[PDB]
């Protein structure tokens, strides 16, 4: 309803309801071709990064990685109701790669466990 | 197998069994390659906004409105072809897609809440 990035200044709990609005605007002479290839590569890298986490095809993907209190010692009543996604993105610029590595490792363990359970007669 | 588009003149209930033949011919001068990739990715993004991420046949929670088409299934699937059907519901396609998006958004929140119960 608010359009692309319209919820950027709203709280992240409210901005979480506009994920499809943001997603639809990521895909749409030599400079035009380079720009289009670059947009495709950024989209595909984000989709691969979601895929290796078991979040393919989802915009809201819950995981089984616990939140470390050292990453951000805040309550949900403060993170989701009184903070925006931009402020959060600034706050956890550090530790983002730690979270991504833990998500990748958790998905590898989940894929092995699912393979062993499905192979269990 | 009939080949690419070989079921185009067949009925919907027959052509719907050849979806992989059509799917395998969507990916396989630079402007043409990038345009084909963009069209493929836009279609896959529309499928991923809906819950139909990895499926070629996907059942949704959007009820069918009789104002879009009032034909019964014995005509749509057994008598009508996909070209005639595509012509019939062009005027409502953008409505239907919007509702599909809304349904998935609600589903995602509901799933997020259902997985939130201890």
């Amino acid at each position, epitope marked *: 309803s608010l359009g692309f990035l319209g919820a950027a200044g709203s709280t992240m709990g409210a901005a*979480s309801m506009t994920l499809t609005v943001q997603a639809r605007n990521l895909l749409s002479g030599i400079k035009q071709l380079q720009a289009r290839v670059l947009a495709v590569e950024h989209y595909l890298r984000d989709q691969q990064l979601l895929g290796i986490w078991g979040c393919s095809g989802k915009l809201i993907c819950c995981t089984n990685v616990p939140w470390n209190s050292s990453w951000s010692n805040r309550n949900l009543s403060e993170i989701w109701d009184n903070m925006t996604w931009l402020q959060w993105d600034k706050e956890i610029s550090n530790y983002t790669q730690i979270i991504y590595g833990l998500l990748e490792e958790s998905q590898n363990q989940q894929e092995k466990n699912e393979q062993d359970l499905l192979a269990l007669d | 197998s009939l080949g690419f588009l070989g079921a185009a003149g067949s009925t919907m209930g027959a052509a719907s069994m050849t979806l992989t033949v059509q799917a395998r011919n969507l990916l396989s001068q630079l402007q043409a390659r990038v345009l084909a990739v963009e069209h493929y990715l836009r279609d896959q993004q529309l499928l991923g906004i809906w819950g139909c991420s990895g499926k070629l046949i996907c059942c949704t929670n959007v009820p069918w409105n009789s104002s879009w088409s009032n034909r019964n299934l014995s005509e749509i699937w057994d008598n009508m072809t996909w070209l005639q059907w595509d012509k019939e519901i062009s005027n409502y396609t953008q409505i239907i897609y919007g509702l599909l998006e809304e349904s998935q958004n609600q589903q995602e*929140k509901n799933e997020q809440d259902l997985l939130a119960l*201890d």
Partner: antibody
Amino acid sequence: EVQLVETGGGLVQPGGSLKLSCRASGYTFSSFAMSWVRQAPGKGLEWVSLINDRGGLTFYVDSVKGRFTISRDNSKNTLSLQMHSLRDGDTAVYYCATGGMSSALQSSKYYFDFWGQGALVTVS
Amino acid sequence: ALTQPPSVSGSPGQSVTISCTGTSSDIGSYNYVSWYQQHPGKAPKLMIYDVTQRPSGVSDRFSGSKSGNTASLTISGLQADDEADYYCSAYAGRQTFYIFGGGTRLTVL
């Protein structure tokens, strides 16, 4: 701190239907999950149904899953409970309450907090 | 479901413990145990939530504890803490959301 006012019904025969409702005031209705809890005249409290803040998810005890429907209207700040196939064992005071489950982005509750004033259901 | 003592009693100026017990799926596996005060003729109000916490508007001398599969409500003073059944409740998973069991008609003589 908040006000919850139920509207009840009268006497219904076995096999009939009865609609209860609850109105909320003094807080944002759409921000909290709501529930219905039953109390027989001579027994303790029994939870019957729970609905989330958006109205999309409903939960029931096994004994009422095929009989009771809970509905929520966030624009009228109104709850309703439509009960079918009532039996004499369902004669009780029903309360609406704010509490129960929270919608994943909120602090965990799993408790009832604000209670209404009660509504009587009498079944012949 | 939840077993409670048979309406314990005590003098004004003394304290009581009201137990609430169950199985591993009701108490042992969850820390979501709450207590409610239901005055006769009035609706119940929240007294204790999350085992040890009390909401704003509720006075002190009401506390609780948990060990094993047993939770308890400690009430001190009994300063006109009139009989109000003192119901316990616990979360028992997705299939059985809430159970209350019985009640404890505490009297302050």
